[PDB]
Amino acid sequence: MSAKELRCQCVKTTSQVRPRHITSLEVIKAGPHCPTAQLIATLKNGRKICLDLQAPLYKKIIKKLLES
Amino acid sequence: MSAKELRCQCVKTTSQVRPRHITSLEVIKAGPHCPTAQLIATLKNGRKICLDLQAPLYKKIIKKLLES
Amino acid sequence: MSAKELRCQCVKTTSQVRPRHITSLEVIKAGPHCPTAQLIATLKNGRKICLDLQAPLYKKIIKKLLES
Amino acid sequence: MSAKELRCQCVKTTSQVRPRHITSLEVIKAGPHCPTAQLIATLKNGRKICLDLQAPLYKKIIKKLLES
């Protein structure tokens, strides 16, 4: 009914990183081990941080991808 | 050829698939081998099709991920 | 020695899952946030667990991918 | 039991790239759209090429990931 916690280190949001030289990002919804919305990303230096979906921060990312 | 046809496997858009029962999707911008905007996706049956970014089709996907 | 617990959900090994109806699997080396060897995986039910690289468990996976 | 016109993101093998400063690589078996073994990869410059599974080329990659 209302699962909580399980296997998602991307809890809350890793917005500590800033959007700009991004390359690609994944977006998984709240699955089983992840009852919360989970979004991970990837930079130009093939590494992956993670952002949220209910914030204008990642909207600057997708918006930066629509620009082209 | 002035940014056109390089090594991208999903040209135009693979909208032949319908939204819902999805799991996660990739969002890559127009890189080098892919001068065009490229977006891939993933379904419940761990497979991957691909959609576009300038259309309301994938907007139904992200919107389906925000409703939660 | 290099870094200590930064961004790795696959600590030790998630071998609780058994190999068989797999689809694809990732394998990242020990980066910065992940000084430990880290590899994730994907099943038929588009989900992702994670295994190790110094064990015969994932070798049954790659071996199952070579048989074809 | 059916193999006709499908969509492999990488036919044959993109060995044109050399192994060395890699970051992570995908390993998907012969799915439906891809009845052939399909393996993709990722470099330090977050990009993705693709290699094979029945060759010692990618074995140098996994071997380089085990050395650690």
Side-chain angles (χ1 to χ4, degrees):
Chain A
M1 278 250 153
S2 269
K4 213 252 279 248
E5 228 141 45
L6 234 145
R7 300 294 250 60
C8 259
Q9 302 290 283
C10 173
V11 59
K12 286 198 135 108
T13 340
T14 302
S15 314
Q16 286 192 244
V17 185
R18 246 175 153 120
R20 248 292 246 235
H21 331 262
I22 246 280
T23 180
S24 71
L25 144 151
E26 37 174 288
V27 190
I28 79 204
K29 213 230 259 151
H33 64 265
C34 220
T36 175
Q38 193 266 67
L39 175 109
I40 291 287
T42 344
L43 252 134
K44 55 135 300 202
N45 317 268
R47 66 189 250 196
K48 293 97 80 145
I49 39 52
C50 97
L51 294 184
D52 243 329
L53 241 299
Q54 216 107 53
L57 177 61
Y58 92 102
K59 252 211 288 186
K60 266 283 200 170
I61 285 170
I62 295 177
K63 277 176 100 111
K64 262 218 92 194
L65 295 155
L66 284 132
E67 318 203 314
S68 29
Chain B
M1 200 123 158
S2 277
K4 212 136 269 292
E5 269 136 325
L6 230 159
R7 212 158 95 293
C8 232
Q9 312 296 279
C10 232
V11 62
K12 289 190 205 272
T13 340
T14 314
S15 166
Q16 208 106 133
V17 181
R18 55 247 241 194
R20 210 230 186 301
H21 29 244
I22 214 191
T23 183
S24 311
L25 93 83
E26 318 185 340
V27 189
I28 306 103
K29 210 240 234 179
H33 64 253
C34 209
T36 175
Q38 210 220 148
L39 178 109
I40 296 299
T42 344
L43 258 299
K44 270 285 300 228
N45 318 130
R47 63 200 312 168
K48 290 96 102 90
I49 38 53
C50 98
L51 293 182
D52 237 283
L53 240 101
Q54 231 274 73
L57 179 59
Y58 91 102
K59 290 192 119 297
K60 260 181 131 176
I61 285 167
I62 297 175
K63 270 219 295 121
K64 242 183 206 282
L65 294 161
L66 289 138
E67 73 182 274
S68 226
Chain C
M1 288 229 111
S2 241
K4 213 219 198 161
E5 249 216 324
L6 312 89
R7 185 221 67 106
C8 304
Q9 337 194 146
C10 183
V11 58
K12 183 205 156 118
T13 339
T14 311
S15 168
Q16 222 134 66
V17 179
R18 289 168 215 194
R20 254 150 169 250
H21 61 170
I22 214 70
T23 68
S24 335
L25 140 159
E26 318 182 275
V27 166
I28 309 108
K29 210 230 284 181
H33 22 271
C34 236
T36 174
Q38 195 248 138
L39 37 162
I40 294 300
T42 345
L43 259 302
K44 256 225 198 87
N45 305 294
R47 63 202 217 169
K48 287 99 68 155
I49 38 54
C50 95
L51 295 184
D52 47 31
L53 188 70
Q54 249 142 236
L57 178 59
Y58 92 104
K59 250 224 152 88
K60 260 197 79 215
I61 285 170
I62 296 172
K63 273 223 144 73
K64 258 180 236 176
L65 301 149
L66 283 131
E67 62 99 339
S68 229
Chain D
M1 52 251 247
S2 160
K4 314 168 157 247
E5 50 123 69
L6 295 149
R7 218 196 186 71
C8 277
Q9 307 152 59
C10 224
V11 195
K12 298 174 171 297
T13 340
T14 298
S15 163
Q16 245 130 17
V17 180
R18 234 152 231 208
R20 255 137 128 83
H21 48 191
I22 214 64
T23 69
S24 310
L25 91 84
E26 318 186 60
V27 191
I28 148 272
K29 223 190 97 252
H33 63 133
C34 212
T36 174
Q38 210 222 238
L39 177 108
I40 297 300
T42 343
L43 250 140
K44 52 170 208 172
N45 305 321
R47 69 172 117 207
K48 294 97 72 77
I49 38 53
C50 95
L51 293 182
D52 47 40
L53 247 60
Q54 250 220 35
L57 176 67
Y58 93 105
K59 287 185 157 271
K60 259 184 159 135
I61 285 172
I62 297 175
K63 276 271 268 256
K64 272 191 255 218
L65 298 169
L66 283 132
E67 62 100 334
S68 62

